[PDB]
Amino acid sequence: EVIDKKAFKDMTRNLYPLNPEQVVKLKQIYETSEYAKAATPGTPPKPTATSQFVNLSPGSTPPVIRLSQGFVSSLVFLDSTGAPWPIAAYDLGDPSSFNIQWDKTSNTLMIQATKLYNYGNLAVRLRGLNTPVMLTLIPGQKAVDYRVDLRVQGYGPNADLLLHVLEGVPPPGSRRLVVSGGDARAWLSNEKMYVRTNLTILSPGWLASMTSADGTHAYEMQKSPVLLVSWHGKVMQLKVEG
Amino acid sequence: KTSNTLMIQATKLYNYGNLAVRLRGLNTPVMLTLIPGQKAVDYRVDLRVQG
Amino acid sequence: QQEIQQRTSDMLTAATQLVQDWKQVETQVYTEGT
Amino acid sequence: QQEIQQRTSDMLTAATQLVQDWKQVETQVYTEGT
Amino acid sequence: QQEIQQRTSDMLTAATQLVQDWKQVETQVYTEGT
Amino acid sequence: QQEIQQRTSDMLTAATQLVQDWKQVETQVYTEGT
Amino acid sequence: RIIYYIQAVIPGRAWLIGSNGSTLTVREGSKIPGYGMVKLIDSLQGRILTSSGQVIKFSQEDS
Amino acid sequence: RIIYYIQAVIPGRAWLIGSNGSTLTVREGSKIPGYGMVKLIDSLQGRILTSSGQVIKFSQEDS
Amino acid sequence: RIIYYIQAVIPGRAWLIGSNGSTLTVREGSKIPGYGMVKLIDSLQGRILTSSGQVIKFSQEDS
Amino acid sequence: RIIYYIQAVIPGRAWLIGSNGSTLTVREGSKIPGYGMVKLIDSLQGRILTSSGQVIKFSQEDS
How far is CA B32 from each of CA A71, B45, G25, rounded to the nearest angstrom? Predict the structure, then answer.
């Protein structure tokens, strides 16, 4: 009668030759093997964004664009006024390494470096530009750029910071300032205090003020170590240091 | 075709990638990078625009 | 003592038969009416 | 000591039959209706 | 000592598989809508 | 002393594979617009 | 000072976000203000060592 | 004074950009103001020595 | 004390809703106020063992 | 007090309709008021045994 149980356990071992713990172990082994076999050797490049000028003198060095394998290289062309100057026609040497995605009416260019260590060159005629503008490109560099802005010498056919402060961007040339008892931030940029809050100041006045819909305020003012703030009908005094 | 939303999926486990988006009101396109296989999964990504 | 394997063999495909029966799954039927 | 090769063969079939399952992955499907 | 050559052969087949899985690279894509 | 010939032969096959690819170089492209 | 959280980490490169909403990326050989020199990067278990004896990780609740 | 950086590096050609914003491409044998004579251009790791003992390299931010 | 109920438990992660509705997801290595550290989480049998010698379990009607 | 009738019985769970209209389902590990603790649930012959010496079954006329 134990022959049936022996047949059951032998049949179970023949049907499943592995323990479940062995199954999960080899699954982790497969995950590690996949991770190593599709790991990327070498130091990866740093993704960046660049803006340069186009030198149209007859003795300048042409600009070189750093590329990556299978990654987007987007170029945006502007004039000296910064206005978008769209692209009429273009040409690329050796497209076996580089694919071009070009909207008909745009200055936007999308390049993918298909070959590993082969570098190329390109020329572009704009809609009003007399002299065509050319670039040289090389993939596999230590830094890679996502958006490359190119400001040209010629005029195109087409031609404050407090809004971005109210959005949340601090102005440059500043340092963080510690305050006591204040749900606000202050920045000194060019001997002018920019303070972002949601409160209302009373005593020293402001040069300018900008308020948002959700209740945030931005104040531009001179130097003042002391502030009086009216919140919910009551006045609170606070101090700040330069 | 008229959406304001991106609905993507990751095919592999850790392969990095990138894209560029030309918006309806944006002259300058915006390029974003994507990586799967981290310690946290972004169930949704909301993006404030200065423009 | 060779009778174990013929005891082992016949129930193997018998067990393999019914172990497929825990695998199938059918989509439900959904409709409207008026 | 020669019974290892019997137990060597079957697990290789057992290893292969599920490691192919951990390669494919179905596409997400978006449904649109008014 | 032919097992070393056998080992080298199977690892060489695996290495050819890996290098032919590394060789290919597809292209970028465009999506335009209004 | 007889190992030179097979060490020549794989070098023959590899270099002939290289010299085929050293010759060609594809044409440039041009795209218009308005 | 400023708490940095690892947001993304690959072999070679790491991605940090500070206390004040500042995003940044770093490599193995680099200098970080307030922390000094990044000695080694452990992509396993999200671990970063700097020269000031500090370890950068993901957040405990944001993990 | 004026400090240059390596923008693009291949064997045979080196691309430099100064602190003034002016950029150029040069070979191993060249003369550059502020550095002198380029003794060595190394293809690996982006390091270029000059006769005045200075080393040109990628930036910390441009890495 | 605020009592957490296992709304969802998988291998690796678990989901707890508190007495007042505090909804969260916990991994194996974390901390819990009123129970200390998280040491052992059992995906089978519906039990989470903490450092304070206590077990979070499915309730009778929360099942 | 409250009695119950075996409405639906599966292995594992059970369904009991109360005398006052209390229809519910229950598992093996339960604290049933008026009956206490269930030591065993048997789908054979429709018997539910309790620690209070009480056994719940079908009705005689509803059988």
Answer: 11, 12, 14
Residues of G within 8 A of A42 (CB-CB) are: 12
How many residues are recorded in chain G? 63
Which residue of chain B has the CA closest to G46? B39
Closest CA to A226 of A206, A207, A204: A204
In sequence order, the 6+-apart residues with CB closer than 8 A to the CB of A26 are: A18, D15
A203 at E interface, C-beta within 8 A:
no
Question: Whose structure tokens read 């063969």?
Answer: D9
Angle of the A20-37 helix axis to the D4-19 helix axis, nearest 10: 60
Answer whether G10 sits within 8 Å of B40, measured CB to CB: no
Q: Which residue of C3, C5, C6, C7 to mutate against A (max A Cβ within 10 Å)?
A: C7
Mutate which: B11, B15, B31, B48, vs A, most A CBs within 10 A: B31
E runs forming strands in chain I:
5-9, 14-17, 23-26, 31-32, 36-42, 47-50, 55-57
Q: Which of I17, I16, I39 is nearest to I26 (CA)?
A: I16
Q: How far is CA G35 from the centre of its chain?
A: 10
Structure tokens at E24: 């290919």
Query: Given CB atoms, is H45 within the 8 Å cutoff of chain G?
Result: no
G24 HSE (CA, 13 A, CB side): 20
Q: Supply φ then ψ for residue B15, to 5 degrees.
A: -80, 120
Tokens 């599920």: give the residue. Answer: D18
Give the C-alpha separation, A220 to A193, whole Å. Answer: 6
Instruction: Work out the end-to-end distance of chain J between its first and last CA atoms, rounded to an integer number of angstroms.
Output: 23
Q: Please give the method by which this entry was determined.
A: cryo-EM
Secondary structure of B26-51 in HEC code, one letter for each residue: CCCCEEEEECCCCCCCCCCCCCCCCC
Distance CA A142, CA A150 (A): 21
The neighbour count for residue A104, using CB atoms within 10 Å, is 11
Instruction: Please state, in angstroms and rounded to a whole number, the distance separating the CA atoms of residues J42 and J63.
Output: 17
In angstroms, this model's resolution equals 4.6
Name the minimum distance, in Å, from the CA of G31 to any CA of chain H. Answer: 8
CA distance A5 to chain B (A): 44
CA distance B9 to C4: 53
Tell me which long-range contacts I23-31 makes (C-beta under 8 A, separation of at least 24): I27/G63, I30/G60, I31/G60
Q: Is I31 on the interface with G (CB under 8 A)?
A: yes
DSSP H or E stretch at residue G15: strand G14-17
Query: What is the pairing mode between strands A217-221 and A73-78?
Result: unpaired
On whether any CB of chain I is under 8 Å from the CB of G45, the answer is no
| Interior angle at CA A207, CA A203 and CA A210, nearest 5 | 95
In DSSP notation, A56-78 reads -STTPPPPEEEE-BT--EEEEEE
Cα J46 from Cα J60, distance rounded (Å)? 12
- Looking at residue A64, its amino acid is V
Q: What is the 8-class DSSP label of residue F9?
A: H
In one letter, which amino acid is J17?
A: I
